[PDB]
Design a protein that fits this description.
Interacts with CSK. Interacts with LPXN. Interacts with CBL. Interacts with TRAF3 (via MATH domain); the interaction promotes TRAF3 polyubiquitination. Helix content is 26%, strand content 17%. By secondary structure, it is an alpha/beta fold.
Length: 280
């Protein structure tokens, strides 16, 4: 019961090696026909292209999380966010793109309709100078924000080492639900700040507070893919970590089948790998 990826890493070392392990992920509707292995039509749909931040990042239809709450007629079923599976079920994680000033309502709508409890934002409003996301949480000091019938009130916040734990009292109908936003601000960008002690500390913390887990960054797939997969393994480990050829590759392989490019960087690939690693 001691699979040794350990005694097999000492030789799986660098670029071309990890590049070729990352090149093999040509999970771009390939095989023998780049024909919509997984179409993306509700994303490309008329009044929906604008609900999408990045263009390229199109959410799959078979995994697209639709909306049902209809606070106002105007409501659209579409939200750029997919359901990624976990060790047991098919609604373990939900990866969305950064909310948009327009998609703020939908964002909450979901959170509410899908009874999420733990939100994970792996960005900073602005990174490298450019804006990467839209605020939706209400900060302390002030009081009540308001995204439609949805009222977001911060009960408090833990300004911890590399992230802040938000507690947000959200009142929709005459009912108010409590939510926790793990705002992971630290993280250079997408290359190699290889010291994921906190990416693990965070994940642990989240597992400290079953209902879906809303993981999201900017495109909602770069850094969110990397969390999912670490936690996903994190999960196998502490129970039965099915030793099949099941590796980080085959792992991210299933991951990017739910959402295009759930890990689009070799560096991020090597990252989810090294963290999986530290978990000895």
């Amino acid at each position: 019961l001691q699979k040794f990826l350990d005694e097999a890493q000492s030789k799986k070392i660098t670029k071309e090696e990890f590049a070729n392990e990352f090149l093999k992920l040509k999970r771009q509707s390939t095989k023998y026909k780049a024909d919509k292995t997984y179409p993306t039509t509700v994303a490309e749909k008329p009044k929906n292209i604008k609900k999408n931040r990045y263009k390229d990042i199109l959410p799959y239809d078979y995994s697209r999380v639709e909306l049902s709450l209809i606070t106002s007629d105007e409501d659209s079923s579409y939200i750029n966010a997919n359901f990624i599976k976990g060790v047991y079920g098919p609604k373990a994680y939900i990866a969305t793109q950064g909310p948009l000033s327009t998609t703020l309502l939908d964002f909450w709508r979901m959170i509410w309709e899908y009874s999420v409890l733990i939100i994970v934002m792996a960005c900073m409003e602005y990174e490298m100078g450019k804006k990467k996301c839209e605020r939706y949480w209400a900060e302390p000091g002030e009081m009540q924000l308001e995204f439609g019938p949805f009222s977001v009130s911060c009960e408090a916040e833990k300004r911890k080492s590399d992230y802040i734990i938000r507690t947000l009292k959200v009142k929709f109908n005459s009912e108010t639900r409590t939510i926790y936003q793990f705002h992971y601000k630290n993280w250079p960008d997408h290359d190699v700040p290889s010291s994921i002690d906190p990416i693990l500390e965070l994940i642990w913390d989240v597992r400290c507070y079953s209902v879906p887990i809303c993981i999201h960054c900017s495109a909602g797939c770069g850094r969110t893919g990397v969390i999912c997969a670490i936690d996903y393994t994190w999960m196998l480990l502490k129970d039965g970590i099915i030793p099949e050829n099941f590796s980080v590759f085959s792992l991210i392989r299933e991951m990017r089948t739910q959402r295009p490019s759930l890990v689009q960087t070799q560096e991020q690939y090597e990252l989810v790998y090294n963290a999986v690693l530290e978990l000895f």
